[PDB]
Design a protein around this ligand. Structure first.
Ligand SMILES: Nc1ncnc2c1ncn2[C@@H]1O[C@H](CSCC[C@H](N)C(=O)O)[C@@H](O)[C@H]1O
Ligand SMILES: Nc1ncnc2c1ncn2[C@@H]1O[C@H](CSCC[C@H](N)C(=O)O)[C@@H](O)[C@H]1O
Lengths: 155, 156
């Protein structure tokens, strides 16, 4: 299937490690927009317990513009606490790209402002909550989308 | 609301830190069955970026039997790769307790064998997948259950 997770300038290695495993366990495709806050090193990756098939599937983009041009996403959603519809309120479809920001910074306003409110998605939280852990946020979105499609590829 | 997450002998501090924040963000109640693989230290907790309201809400149980006796769960589910219904296949209700195993070991067979297959839940994964990260598995279950109830307590 054709669902895509995009990490914008991820900073914390274990978050990305968790996300690689997640996408491999679900068949989602993972994209990373450079620069990252860590070395992309096959050794550290296998070191973290990741198999080759898991991390070579990942595609790395030199920057946001390069990503758009390379991927030409059919639809692009941004996950942000400043979003409107819940992640379970959108109907995901093939060719969707779901974008997440860096741990300390979040997504730059410039990228957010170019998207319709309807494509900026907020995972619900209780009032006055602090942000979710990045890999947890990705997990929640991936599994909701996958559920919507009937867990294709899971037996 | 009354939904409960239970960690059985969690080993890896950051996993638990993530789960504390998750439960606080969602209004789920967190339970931990000792012994843990780390010191329960308010200083390290606030150190990790956790607020006081987040980690004092957590209830720690000396062991599994003490947990059952203290909590008397209306229904107890175990999350295991060896489970049957998907996490999205159960209808969660108030008084549910959802139990997760430790990172290196998983839940002991003794606990699993005492549960009906119908209460052993598997989060779907592609064939020949390796286990999920613990906090990611908890997040997925928490958000599915919360979704079923209409995200009560979240203002949308
Ligand atoms: N409730 C939520 N809804 C949507 N995205 C979320 C989210 N919580 C976290 N994220 C995602 O996770 C990323 C990193 S967390 C964002 C920064 C936040 N101020 C913090 O305290 O860490 C975000 O850029 C966003 O993509
Ligand atoms: N596919 C799945 N379905 C249900 N529970 C799962 C699961 N994958 C992991 N878990 C839960 O996560 C627990 C720990 S296995 C997770 C360890 C993970 N590799 C880590 O380092 O964090 C298991 O006991 C189980 O309760």
């Amino acid at each position: 299937m054709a669902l895509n997770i995009v990490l914008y300038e991820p900073e914390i290695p274990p978050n990305t490690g968790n996300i690689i495993r997640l996408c491999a366990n679900t068949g989602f495709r993972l994209h990373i927009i450079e620069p990252m806050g860590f070395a992309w090193d096959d050794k550290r990756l296998r070191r973290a317990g990741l198999d080759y098939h898991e991390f070579t599937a990942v595609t790395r983009h030199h920057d946001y513009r390069a990503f758009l041009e390379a991927e030409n996403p059919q639809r692009l959603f941004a996950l942000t606490t400043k979003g409107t519809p819940a992640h379970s309120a959108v109907s995901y479809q093939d060719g969707d790209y779901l974008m997440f920001g860096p741990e300390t910074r979040g997504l730059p306003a410039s990228i957010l402002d170019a998207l319709p409110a309807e494509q900026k998605i907020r995972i619900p939280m209780v009032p006055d909550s602090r942000s979710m852990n990045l890999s947890n946020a990705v997990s929640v979105v991936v599994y909701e989308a996958w559920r919507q499609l009937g867990y294709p590829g899971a037996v």
